[PDB]
Design a protein around this motif. Structure first.
Motif, PDB file in Angstrom:
ATOM      1  N   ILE A   1       0.852  -1.180   0.000  1.00 14.09           N
ATOM      2  CA  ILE A   1       0.000   0.000   0.000  1.00 14.09           C
ATOM      3  C   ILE A   1       0.891   1.234   0.000  1.00 14.09           C
ATOM      4  N   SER A   2       0.294   2.371  -0.344  1.00 13.68           N
ATOM      5  CA  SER A   2       1.012   3.638  -0.390  1.00 13.68           C
ATOM      6  C   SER A   2       0.870   4.449   0.891  1.00 13.68           C
ATOM      7  N   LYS A   3       0.217   3.905   1.917  1.00 15.82           N
ATOM      8  CA  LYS A   3       0.037   4.587   3.190  1.00 15.82           C
ATOM      9  C   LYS A   3       0.396   3.624   4.310  1.00 15.82           C
ATOM     10  N   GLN A   4       1.186   4.093   5.270  1.00 14.33           N
ATOM     11  CA  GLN A   4       1.696   3.209   6.307  1.00 14.33           C
ATOM     12  C   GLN A   4       0.589   2.782   7.264  1.00 14.33           C
ATOM     13  N   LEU A   5       0.688   1.539   7.735  1.00 14.20           N
ATOM     14  CA  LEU A   5      -0.264   1.019   8.698  1.00 14.20           C
ATOM     15  C   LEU A   5      -0.025   1.637  10.073  1.00 14.20           C
ATOM     16  N   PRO A   6      -1.022   1.589  10.952  1.00  8.11           N
ATOM     17  CA  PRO A   6      -0.826   2.088  12.316  1.00  8.11           C
ATOM     18  C   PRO A   6       0.072   1.167  13.124  1.00  8.11           C
ATOM     19  N   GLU A   7       0.644   1.731  14.182  1.00  9.01           N
ATOM     20  CA  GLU A   7       1.561   0.979  15.021  1.00  9.01           C
ATOM     21  C   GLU A   7       0.816  -0.107  15.790  1.00  9.01           C
TER      22      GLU A   7
END
Ligand SMILES: [Mg+2]
Ligand SMILES: [Mg+2]
Ligand SMILES: [Mg+2]
Ligand SMILES: [Mg+2]
Ligand SMILES: [Mg+2]
Ligand SMILES: [Mg+2]
Ligand SMILES: [Mg+2]
Ligand SMILES: [Mg+2]
Ligand SMILES: [Mg+2]
Ligand SMILES: [Mg+2]
Ligand SMILES: [Mg+2]
Ligand SMILES: [Mg+2]
Ligand SMILES: [Mg+2]
Ligand SMILES: [Mg+2]
Ligand SMILES: [Mg+2]
Ligand SMILES: [Mg+2]
Ligand SMILES: [Mg+2]
Ligand SMILES: [Mg+2]
Ligand SMILES: [Mg+2]
Ligand SMILES: [Mg+2]
Ligand SMILES: [Mg+2]
Ligand SMILES: [Mg+2]
Ligand SMILES: [Mg+2]
Ligand SMILES: [Mg+2]
Lengths: 48, 106, 46, 377
Positions: D190-196
């Motif tokens: 994906i082009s957006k990072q996942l949450p921690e």
RNA sequence: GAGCUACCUAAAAACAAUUUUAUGAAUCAACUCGUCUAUGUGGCAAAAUAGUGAGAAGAUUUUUAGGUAGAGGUGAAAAGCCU
RNA sequence: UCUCCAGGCAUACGCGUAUAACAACUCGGAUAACCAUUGUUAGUUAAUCAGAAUAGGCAAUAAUCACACUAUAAAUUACCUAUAACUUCUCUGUUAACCCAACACCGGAAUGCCUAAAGGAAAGAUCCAAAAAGAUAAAAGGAACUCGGCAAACAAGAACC
């Protein structure tokens, strides 16, 4: 066993059994440092 | 006739073997489907341009990828782009795709 | 040029040129072995 | 008002202090490189002999070794903390199993010894693709994501040092190099990072294992070839982040063979080692796509998850990257550590008789569904 | 005896930058060669060193394995080369 | 720690224990220190690196970012038809400062990556004679040197047989 003939095996042949074994092995202290589970042996060159 | 057979006369021979008549151009019904702006995908051109770039350059660690790798990649990538329309048109879950399947008739 | 290094070792070339199988290929080569056996050589061939 | 000269070692001398000063000279050329390609090029251009790390490996207890090479703590269980017609998913996933095993008609391969792992590949390939299209309406991110089939993920790092024991370089100090080359069966980018999964600087009482011997004593062999850092695509690709990886374990490592060899306790260990190596490389490679390296450690934890299957049983893993400062110099005063969460393997189905899958387990399917449902915030 | 060397067969490699063009073209590295002078002359070397030079996308150079043998082989003929 | 130098790391081929530790101090290194020497003991770990079923049918369309572009020297098992078998990991290579040149020889030695982050030390101590070898500077002149501008030069331009 070493210095003995193994019967040639062909499809459907019996199992190869060695009743008296000519292989003699010795357990040696490792030269380098080995994991505690590992054990070193010196074995005849014909042993697999 | 198998995949690696190359017909000397091309289409003319193929038409005779299959007893078919050839009409140039796609059917008008199919053409009008995408002419509707509603079918237009979001960022269609930008996504497709990225697909071409990915297949040709970005997918591998090599400088210049070879056809035996990007040619399969481009088509599968395009199909995935066309498969995103399940957001708008449901009932595209009533289909599935298989790989390298054998067909035959006499 | 500097000479003296005419030997460029290669085990494939060596065994093919002077090996057991090569010597037995022709009758003259077999007689090379016969001479060396008669002389008592420890090395009959490479 | 006396301008005393700075008390630093000489740059050109033949000493340890003067060498560590020539090290900061090139290290500063990375700090000052605008683009991330130049940074990675500088960090990897010089090839030296490195241990080759295999995520799928037959060596005993390789999971513990990979923790040490990586500075990862392994926590059993899942990380601490919408109905969508599960039956519809169950029918679709059941169809995929039956389609490849029964209905599909292909030219069978030329080697009997490969007919099974090819079956597992096709079903796991179909299952991933379908679950990415039925869950897409609920999670729109999957619609724009990129699904990679057997693409390569590469990570190269330094950790630790030794004294060269023989030759003209005996007594010299050299770093221990590692590289991971991986080809996950499937992965989603994906082009957006996942949450921690937990805040950076998270501290736990567990301790990373300490290995007395060299990596060589565990069968692990060194080679010198190109050093590469790769996430699955080149730096120019907009999809620069990772969502999930799907791994298929080779037949050589499957449950029946291991039990025969008397290494029954290694059945789960095989799963753990693959996740730590596979996810550490992938989460690490993403970080260096953002400009973070050992001397500029990550400010944001980098997260990815993977599911490991031997074709019938499934296991699920989550990884958080907290540290790229793994070298002896950069790890001198590091309290951070990397975290991986894993669960025991569970069956997804038992067998196919007639044209019906038998023993299908919903619990495992939900875990696949939950992983594919996670989205960036 | 063709692991050197001469020629050949098969399978492989290498050639940046710059200008011309579309090249057995140009400048010049790597690489190949060995023009002129000095040193050396039981020498570092049974033909080298240090400078200076010639070619450097080609009839180029290099690697591996095979072939041709003395009344002979090979030779862009120096009666050259064939440990 | 300082001063200075600038082909290094891998693989192939080759070599065959020169590898590492200890103990020795005779022989070997063109001398010492120390060991490359002597003796003793050790070592190199791989399903990924590397090595080692049968019978028929049939192929016009290079490469060079392969598109455009022309060209000339004209240029790499597959796919099908039937038969047969119907779950497999053993064996071998893995050390080093190494090879070919009688030598620890200023020589010879293929490829990939990189050019100092890797690898190295020109001086045993002293003395500054001649002759000899090499580098740098030159008042005034500028080939008068010499077989010849050989060698050198703050020159390296022009022409002719
Ligand atoms: Mg000789
Ligand atoms: Mg030769
Ligand atoms: Mg020859
Ligand atoms: Mg060029
Ligand atoms: Mg030219
Ligand atoms: Mg020239
Ligand atoms: Mg010229
Ligand atoms: Mg000639
Ligand atoms: Mg003549
Ligand atoms: Mg002679
Ligand atoms: Mg030693
Ligand atoms: Mg000693
Ligand atoms: Mg010794
Ligand atoms: Mg292999
Ligand atoms: Mg080695
Ligand atoms: Mg000498
Ligand atoms: Mg150094
Ligand atoms: Mg000295
Ligand atoms: Mg002196
Ligand atoms: Mg002068
Ligand atoms: Mg003067
Ligand atoms: Mg006079
Ligand atoms: Mg005159
Ligand atoms: Mg002159």
């Amino acid at each position: 066993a070493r210095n003995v003939l193994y019967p040639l095996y062909q499809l459907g042949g019996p199992q190869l059994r060695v009743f008296r074994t000519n292989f003699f092995i010795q357990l040696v202290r490792p030269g380098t440092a080995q994991p505690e589970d590992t054990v070193q042996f010196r074995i005849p060159m014909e042993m697999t | 006739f198998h995949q690696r057979c190359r017909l000397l006369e091309g289409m003319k021979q193929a038409l005779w073997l299959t007893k078919t008549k050839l009409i140039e151009g796609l059917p008008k019904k199919v053409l009008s489907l995408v002419d509707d702006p509603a079918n237009h995908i979001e960022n269609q051109e930008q996504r497709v341009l990225d697909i071409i770039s990915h297949a040709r350059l970005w997918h591998s660690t090599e400088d210049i990828p070879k056809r035996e790798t990007y040619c399969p990649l481009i088509v599968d990538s395009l199909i995935q782009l066309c498969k995103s329309q399940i957001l708008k048109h449901p009932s595209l879950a009533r289909r599935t795709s298989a790989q390298n399947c054998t067909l035959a008739t006499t | 040029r500097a000479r003296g290094n005419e030997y460029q070792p290669s085990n494939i070339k060596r065994k093919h040129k002077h090996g057991w199988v090569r010597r037995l290929s022709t009758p003259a080569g077999v007689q090379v072995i016969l001479r060396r056996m008669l002389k008592g050589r420890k090395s009959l061939s490479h | 008002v006396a301008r005393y000269p700075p008390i630093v070692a000489s740059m050109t001398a033949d000493s340890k202090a003067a060498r560590q000063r020539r090290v900061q000279r090139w290290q500063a050329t990375v700090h000052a490189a605008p683009s991330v390609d130049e940074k990675i090029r500088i960090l990897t251009k010089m090839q030296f002999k490195k241990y080759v790390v295999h995520p799928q490996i037959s060596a005993l207890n390789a999971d513990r070794w990979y923790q040490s090479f990586t500075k990862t703590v392994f926590v059993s269980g899942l990380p601490p903390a919408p109905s969508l017609d599960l039956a519809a998913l169950r029918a679709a996933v059941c169809d995929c199993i039956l389609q490849e095993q029964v209905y599909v008609r292909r030219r069978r391969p030329r080697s009997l010894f490969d007919r099974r792992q090819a079956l597992a590949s096709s079903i796991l390939d179909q299952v991933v693709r379908t679950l990415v299209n039925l869950l897409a309406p609920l999670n729109p991110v999957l619609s724009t994501a990129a699904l990679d089939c057997k693409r390569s993920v590469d990570f190269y790092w330094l950790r630790g040092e030794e004294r060269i024991p023989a030759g003209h370089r005996k007594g010299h100090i050299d770093a221990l190099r590692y590289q991971i080359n991986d080809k996950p069966h499937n992965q989603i980018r994906i082009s957006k990072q996942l949450p921690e999964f937990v805040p950076l600087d998270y501290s736990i009482p567990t301790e990373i294992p300490v290995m007395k011997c060299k990596p060589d004593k565990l069968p692990l062999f060194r080679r010198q070839y190109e050093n590469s850092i790769f996430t699955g695509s080149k730096t120019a690709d907009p999809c620069c982040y990772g969502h999930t990886q799907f791994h298929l374990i080779p037949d050589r490592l499957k449950r029946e063979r291991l039990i025969r060899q008397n290494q029954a306790e290694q059945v789960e260990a095989v799963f753990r080692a693959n996740a730590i190596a596979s996810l550490f490389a992938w989460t690490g490679a993403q970080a260096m796509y953002q400009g973070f390296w050992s001397e500029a450690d990550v400010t944001r934890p980098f997260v990815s998850q993977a599911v490991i299957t031997d074709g019938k049983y499934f296991s699920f893993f989550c990884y958080q990257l907290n540290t790229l400062a793994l070298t002896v110099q950069a790890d001198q005063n590091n309290p951070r550590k990397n975290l991986c969460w894993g669960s025991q393997s569970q069956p997804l189905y038992e067998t196919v008789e007639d044209n019906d899958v038998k023993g299908f387990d919903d619990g495992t399917l939900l875990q696949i569904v939950h992983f594919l449902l996670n989205k960036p915030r």
